Amino acid sequence: LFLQGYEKSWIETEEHYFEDKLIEDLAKPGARVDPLHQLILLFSRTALTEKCKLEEDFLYMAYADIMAKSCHSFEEKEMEKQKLLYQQARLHDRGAAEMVLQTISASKGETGPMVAATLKLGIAILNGGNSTVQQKMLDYLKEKKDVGFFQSLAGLMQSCSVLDLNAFERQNKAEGLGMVTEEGSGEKVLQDDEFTCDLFRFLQLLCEGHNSDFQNYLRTQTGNNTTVNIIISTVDYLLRVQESISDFYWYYSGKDIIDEQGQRNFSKAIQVAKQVFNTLTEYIQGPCTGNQQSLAHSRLWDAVVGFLHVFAHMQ
Amino acid sequence: IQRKAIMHHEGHMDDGLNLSRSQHEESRTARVIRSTVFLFNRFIRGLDALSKKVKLPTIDLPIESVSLSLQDLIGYFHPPDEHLEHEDKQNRLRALKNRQNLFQEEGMINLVLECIDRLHVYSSAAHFADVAGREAGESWKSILNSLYELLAALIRGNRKNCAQFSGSLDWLISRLERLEASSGILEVLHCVLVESPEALNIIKEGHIKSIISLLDKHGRNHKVLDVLCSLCVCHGVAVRSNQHLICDNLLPGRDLLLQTRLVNHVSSMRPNIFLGVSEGSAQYKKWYYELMVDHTEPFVTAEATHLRVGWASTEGYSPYPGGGEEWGGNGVGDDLFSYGFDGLHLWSGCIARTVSSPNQHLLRTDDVISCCLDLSAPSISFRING
Amino acid sequence: DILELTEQEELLQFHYHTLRLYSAVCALGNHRVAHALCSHVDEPQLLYAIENKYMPGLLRAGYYDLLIDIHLSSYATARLMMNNEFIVPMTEETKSITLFPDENKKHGLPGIGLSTSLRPRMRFSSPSFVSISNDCYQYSPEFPLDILKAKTIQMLTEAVKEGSLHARDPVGGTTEFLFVPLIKLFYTLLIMGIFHNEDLKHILQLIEPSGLLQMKLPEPVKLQMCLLLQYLCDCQVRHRIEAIVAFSDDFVAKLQDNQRFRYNEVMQALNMSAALTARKTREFRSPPQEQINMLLNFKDDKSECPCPEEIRDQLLDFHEDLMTHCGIESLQQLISETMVRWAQESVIEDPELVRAMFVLLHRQYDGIGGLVRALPKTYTINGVSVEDTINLLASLGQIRSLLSVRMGKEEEKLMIRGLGDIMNNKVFYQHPNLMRALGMHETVMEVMVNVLGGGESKEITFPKMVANCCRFLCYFCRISRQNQKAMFDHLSYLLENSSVGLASPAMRGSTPLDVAAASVMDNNELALALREPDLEKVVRYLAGCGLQSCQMLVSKGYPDIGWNPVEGERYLDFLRFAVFCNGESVEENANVVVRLLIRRPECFGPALRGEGGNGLLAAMEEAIKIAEDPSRDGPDTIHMGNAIMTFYAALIDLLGRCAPEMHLIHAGKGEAIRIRSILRSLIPLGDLVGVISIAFQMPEPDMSAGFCPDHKAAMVLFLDRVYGIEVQDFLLHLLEVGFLPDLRAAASLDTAALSX
Amino acid sequence: GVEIETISPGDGRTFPKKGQTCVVHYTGMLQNGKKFDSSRDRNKPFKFRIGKQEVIKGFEEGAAQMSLGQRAKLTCTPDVAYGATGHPGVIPPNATLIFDVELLNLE
């Protein structure tokens, strides 16, 4: 039992910092093709290999985290922005944007650790208003006319996670009397909030700059046989999470006492809804008449009515 | 579920016919399927009309046409180059898989099998010529080879095709002994066993025995050994029954395949003495010498110590006496040009014959041997310890 | 001469392929064929062929692979399987490596020191054919390991010396044929538990000196080099874990007496107050895992820390020593340098080699990942149960080897024997945590899915293997409290094929549905976590069984009743175990099962629900009539009347246990009132009392496979939990009609008692 | 079916008896001289008990007629060595065996 506790809460408490130096001496052309470029090409070939299900690929799951954690009062802000751009250039001029796109497209819309890692890598590679990586991704998606990436994004947005009340009620009933484990793993109520916020932050960074071309490509994929409206998928997920938060309020409507578990679930729901709203803002910002009409001709109005109701009552 | 569509006068507002443009690759593939099945049905009808009984030769038997069609289909199903761009190679692999799936889902493998059967009903090219003609009898071999190559290419990479048609393995292994298309049948068997693990579950002892009989009849071919390795291990897993059958029916008598041994190096020493006889000038035709031994271990490292003594002949009146080439296990008496003795047996032609003697034993230490030789009437002789 | 095959292309290729055949015919754990192949080639010809400098190269590689496969591959694979399991004893030799020299300007060499870890015992039977009826010939053929070790060491020295000068004719041809088989033999030898410190030093004296990693080697050579370095780091991680356990022993030995002393001091100087009982409850409750979590947290300024601050200094010193022994701030530096140099030299093909190189570099730069991944798998046991644990590990290795090989009659028999061994190993009872860490349930589940694959309902290949697997899994879930949770994930799978094994009253234990019921049973947390992606599947199976005839009794000769009561009983039993746990009715599960059962009306009996049969009374009377008339059965057998009676009793028991409550929450909740009203509309009261009043015969013994009082017991349970007894009228009516005759029949007993 | 042909005498005075674990050095081979078994290859002797039904009859009934330090050629017969089924894998059915049996030590 002592060894189990030592493994659990003594060693993995952030006791190392090696991602930046590792990426550096892997990109250093000691002398051809750099080692980092060889690794990126290996991951790209593995993602392009025709299969029926994305494998676990512990190597990829362990190196995407490193490549993502490597990245990240006027002169110091500009200098740190330039350093972030330099790191993104260092680890994206070797084809990491194409690697992330291929890894997302080779999942068929199945939520998993590979998709989580590749979304974290996409976030760390598109952090800020990086337009070079956005243009690279757009040119890749245009030169390879594929609907797999877009349908995978649609499936992920459709089956990522939604707050549910039945699991919360069952957890309350279990913790009321069962003290064998105390249910310290507050899951099954909001499955992967981290993954949901990562996906929607990846979309927000894809539409970070006012790229009218990318904002229209995310709506109508011109050149492809079948198109899927990422905007409609996003507003549908917003409606779903709004209904979930409304039901959670209806549950916590009358007792006027919010326990720690309820507070944590509410905070996670608020974070997810805030990320979705930020993604919608990045979608509609600028005179994007297409996305403006798409949001005006949907159930966003019902969603925002429910949101105003829950806002007033919860506040 | 089969909702038969009916054209009616009224109609309902629920049809909703959406379109899919039927990508040019699949369209061309389907047109090739149609052309090939038409030509193969024509060839099958002609060959059946010729085979069931004698008929009029005014029939459609397009020998050169089906030959060219097979030559085109083999190139159609040709695998992509390994020395190519990775993405283009993957695209070509996907296209080949799609073509194989479209050919399988339209009943082409059974058509090729029917064609192979109708070509195998004949025994030889000469037996087929006097029935079909000169050109057909000459091109029957090439047509059978191309058909088997196409059958192999249809299942080279795909897995569902082998897992579906694997029921024809009995027919394949029975036709394996046609003495003509053995290479094609063996390639098809290897390519169906290397991919589909379901095929190994229907390979019984009779099939393995027939494959080993093929190895015993057609000679030493490494394709048979590769097929046996595939039968022993398909995909990282072993089949204990197949392995035991192979071990029992492949090397019980050690004549099916080469053998190995670890033998010793022997050398032949002699004095500068030559004994020849002729009419006129002779050498009295009688000689004799003695022999002793100081130290002799019975087994130096791993095997019996080779130690023989005797008399070796030559090639007339020339040096380089008998022996295979050199350095082998051939000492004295191991050929017809030598006659030796080792203590217990007599060696003449690599065939030891036992003898009787008081206290018979090998040439151990402190053994006195005496070799005498009369040339005209008698032959060599040995005396151990007198 | 075998060396003359260098020019002959036909015999060379044929002999290479026949060597590949010799290797493949006994590659896996098949020793009956290796015991023949050893003499089929030779004992010493392998040594001669691996030693000869003049070889074609194909034959050299073939002979090397043949030697590996027929003499070392079995134990090498066994070690590779049981290499990630760090099972440690508690002997005094384990407490000898508490220093793990890292201080005083030294780091040590990988693989040098003491192992003191549970490893599979190696043994090789002597190949003899004049010995008729050999014992088992199961381990391996015998080989002179020491002679092979000396030969391979001297040959590796000669080979590196030859490669350093870059000759124009390496042994066997290319440098690939020169190095790959030799380094593969050396790698498997180092794996199989030889090359003790003395020889490992000399081995390192050709790759370490700052060599073999500096040459311009091709891809298949550096791949074996990467595998060798990966093993050299795996044994280093193993040494780290051994030192961790060695220090942890003494640390917890001190901490336990310290906490006992503080508890005794509190008991002495109690000074009764309000917080004293709170500290007492904290000591009594908070099981040892939570206790350890509370007593081990001091990295920040101040937190929940106990009185023994003196041992905190020792713990911090040991943790600092661990961190400076790990990769954080020379072997790891050398490996990382070699990897980055190989990657920078030229573009590398062989994505397998690229992956091996990159994972080696990643684990070298990480260091702590290996610990955080392997500490969940390490386990220390004792110095008294070492032989029992060795037998258990041998049985687990045999089970894993049988899982690797294909399934057959002999493989199934050996797997059943291994399951029996691991069930009777006497350590399964004591250490379930060790079983869950080794992952025995995972391997048994993989064996079960491999057996079940191939057929859904047509035919289940290799019967009784799934049975032994399900029985092992049932026992594993039974003797535990968290292994039920560990197995609950596989429940979603095995509920899909839970239809197998049913319709056969010969295995009341082993069954996938029964192992699901065993995993859910006696666990409120698991019963609550059991949501509804599969309750609807169970209800669909119940409906299918109540509609069809199971197509299994018509073949035996049964009268083909229009519904199956043998699978419905099992489905209702599983639903009962899922809905009624520890004596209380799970509210949400009961509600959702009631919803499903009322939405699908065919799940009930046709003679009870529907426009046909009247109700439960006539249903059970027809069942008793069928049981009495043998013309409606199958000519140990399945009594159809008894089966129908047991099905209806199980349905009534499920409804009674899924009743809302004992009115505790029903007195204030309306959903409970609606559920009770639905249950009352389903099952009437006169029906219940009529089926209760049957007055079963009490016997000269009789058969207990007919109308047993368990049916009326379930009826009484349903009446108590649904209708209840509150009015004098109905109480006396039930007492007069149903209870008095049964009580009289139970009192009429002097000596002959066969029905308890 | 069992016989013996003396290759080297072993003083003809010490003989094995029932209840002893004799140490033997043999090299077996088939009728056509093809070697199928040996003991000088693995460099270790063969310790076997006489009358314990562990070795083949053609071997034990032929070794019971030898002397300490004696070399003999023992010829067998299928019905006395392996029968009509032979040894699966190594010995073919109805195979006549020949052993160069050298007696090492008596225990």
Swiss-Prot record, chain C:
Deletion phenotype: Embryonically lethal. Embryos die at about 10 dpc, due to defects in heart tube development. Cardiac myotubes display enlarged rough endoplasmic reticulum and cytoplasmic vesicles that contain high levels of Ca(2+).
How does the record describe the protein's post-translational processing?
Channel activity is modulated by phosphorylation. Phosphorylation is increased in failing heart, leading to calcium leaks and increased cytoplasmic Ca(2+) levels.
Q: Which tissues is it found in, per the record?
A: Highly expressed in heart, lung, cerebellum and brain. Detected at lower levels in adrenal gland, stomach, thymus, esophagus and ovary.
Q: Where in the cell is it found?
A: Sarcoplasmic reticulum membrane
Question: Its quaternary structure?
Answer: Homotetramer. Can also form heterotetramers with RYR1 and RYR3. Interacts with CALM and S100A1; these interactions regulate channel activity. Identified in a complex composed of RYR2, FKBP1B, PKA catalytic subunit, PRKAR2A, AKAP6, and the protein phosphatases PP2A and PP1. Interacts directly with FKBP1B, PKA, PP1 and PP2A. Interacts with FKBP1A and FKBP1B; these interactions may stabilize the channel in its closed state and prevent Ca(2+) leaks. Interacts with SELENON. Identified in a complex, composed of FSD2, CMYA5 and RYR2.
What does the sequence similarity comment in the record state about its family? Belongs to the ryanodine receptor (TC 1.A.3.1) family. RYR2 subfamily.
Describe the function of this protein: Cytosolic calcium-activated calcium channel that mediates the release of Ca(2+) from the sarcoplasmic reticulum into the cytosol and thereby plays a key role in triggering cardiac muscle contraction. Aberrant channel activation can lead to cardiac arrhythmia. In cardiac myocytes, calcium release is triggered by increased Ca(2+) cytosolic levels due to activation of the L-type calcium channel CACNA1C. The calcium channel activity is modulated by formation of heterotetramers with RYR3. Required for cellular calcium ion homeostasis. Required for embryonic heart development.
**Description of its domains:** The calcium release channel activity resides in the C-terminal region while the remaining part of the protein resides in the cytoplasm.
Task: Please state what the protein is called.
Answer: Ryanodine receptor 2
From-to range in the entire protein, with total length? 1641 to 2507 of 4966
UniProtKB/Swiss-Prot annotation, chain D:
Q: Where in the cell is it found?
A: Cytoplasm; Sarcoplasmic reticulum
| Domain PPIase FKBP-type span(s) in chain numbering | 19-107
Q: Which reaction does it catalyse?
A: [protein]-peptidylproline (omega=180) = [protein]-peptidylproline (omega=0)
The known regulators of its activity are described as:
Inhibited by both FK506 and rapamycin.
Name the principal localization, coarsely classed: cytoplasm
Q: Does the keyword Isomerase apply?
A: yes
Q: Tell me which family the UniProt entry assigns to this protein.
A: Belongs to the FKBP-type PPIase family. FKBP1 subfamily.
Q: How does it assemble?
A: Identified in a complex composed of RYR2, FKBP1B, PKA catalytic subunit, PRKAR2A, AKAP6, and the protein phosphatases PP2A and PP1. Interacts directly with RYR2.
Main function: Has the potential to contribute to the immunosuppressive and toxic effects of FK506 and rapamycin. PPIases accelerate the folding of proteins. It catalyzes the cis-trans isomerization of proline imidic peptide bonds in oligopeptides.
Q: Which keywords has UniProt assigned to this entry?
A: Cytoplasm, Isomerase, Rotamase, Sarcoplasmic reticulum
Identify the taxonomic lineage of the organism of origin: Eukaryota, Metazoa, Chordata, Craniata, Vertebrata
Q: Which GO terms describe its biological process?
A: 'de novo' protein folding; calcium-mediated signaling; insulin secretion involved in cellular response to glucose stimulus; negative regulation of calcium-mediated signaling; negative regulation of heart rate; negative regulation of insulin secretion involved in cellular response to glucose stimulus; negative regulation of release of sequestered calcium ion into cytosol; neuronal action potential propagation
| Gene Ontology cellular component annotations, sorted alphabetically | calcium channel complex; cytoplasm; membrane; sarcoplasmic reticulum membrane; Z disc
Identify the enzyme class. Answer: isomerase
Citing just one GO molecular function, the answer is: calcium channel regulator activity
Kindly state the tissue distribution recorded for this protein: Detected in heart muscle (at protein level). Isoform 1 and isoform 2 are ubiquitous with highest levels in brain and thymus.
Record's superkingdom? Eukaryota
Listed name of the protein: Peptidyl-prolyl cis-trans isomerase FKBP1B
Report the EC number(s), separated by commas if there are several. 5.2.1.8
- Mind telling me which Pfam families this protein's record contains? FKBP_C
